[PDB]
Symmetry: C3
Subunit: 149 residues, 3 copies
């Protein structure tokens, strides 16, 4: 039983040129790349992505920080929504555990390199927001017998 999560490399991940390192951390667990697209995020899509923060005082600055190149991604694996959140670490890098992306790469929450869906409902919504169904690619990893019990 696998699931799919939406992971997005933020403009800081692009500009610091750590895209490959980020992808490698998820590939290392045998997570499958189901979708991937470079785009430039717009305020319109970011308002919907961050709909849960509508009307809040930090939202305008958050949208500004995120208006730039982003790598949209879908990864598949067992419990991958919760596991990817664990791998990213706490929102504030200073509170994130050693060995997580945010602790290993970042200093402040406003430049914390990566987004990941936080629940099954948010993963389904975010994947549908950033990807059309034809962009989601179905294939089986050749090492599946050695990844899944």
């Amino acid at each position: 039983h696998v699931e799919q999560t939406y992971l997005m490399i933020k403009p800081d991940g692009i500009q610091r040129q750590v895209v490959g390192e980020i992808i490698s951390r998820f590939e290392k667990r045998g997570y499958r790349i189901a979708a991937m697209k470079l785009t430039i995020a717009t305020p319109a899509i970011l308002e919907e992505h961050y709909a849960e923060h509508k009307g809040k005082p930090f939202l305008p600055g958050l949208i500004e920080k995120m208006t730039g190149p982003v790598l949209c991604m879908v990864f598949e694996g067992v419990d991958v929504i919760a596991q990817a959140r664990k791998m990213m670490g706490s929102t504030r890098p200073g509170e994130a555990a050693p060995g997580t992306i945010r602790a290993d790469f970042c200093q402040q929450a406003g430049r914390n390199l990566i987004h990941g869906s936080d629940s099954a409902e948010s993963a389904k919504r975010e994947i549908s927001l950033w990807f059309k169904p034809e962009e989601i690619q179905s294939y089986k990893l050749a090492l599946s017998d050695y990844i899944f019990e």
Copy 2:
């Protein structure tokens, strides 16, 4: 005072071709390779290895997963039995801490890449099962003065 632990790369570690990465994690701490051998695990040896689980419903499938190439290893260091367990992380990769082998490489307990002895008694038993005493090598690490206090 140093001790020795039995560590075994399971068929998934061989087939995913991460043997060198695993070894490097233990070398990085100045643990000494006291024994190393590639073999193919068979049911009769695995039944001894997993003797405590004789008769449990999960055992036949466990033996099937483990019937394959394995890298038998003995590493030596301070508190190495407990430390190697900590480095591997929880049996269930989803519960394992970031930075541990199972958290960094794996998804499920049935394919969790590596075995390590859980106690002094188990290390003696497992080293005797998988190695002949001839295969344990005695030598001193040249960097000892900078590894040990």
Copy 3:
């Protein structure tokens, strides 16, 4: 606001030839190298460095272990004093969290690879002990807009 911490690679870090790896861990978070100097630590300077341990029974052996080549460093970043301590891990490598320097490289407290200031007051004192003000270099990281919120 950013702050500055004193970090020192101990003789074991020099002799095990892991200097670059240590530096890379701090650079990876966008911490800025403000000062760096290779020297050979001597008892007189180490007595001042370890002044808080004056008169204690273990101090003589600590000074002996530390008499050797060291890399003096100053790193700058948000909350860098506390964060560098978190990255180093517990004094005892066996208690340190996976993903920390001491857990990843070391076995025992007496050979734990690296020193870092434990407080704002000790950072100011240690930077002044090991560096003259003219050795502290001020420049801005080109990726600042993507590191700091």
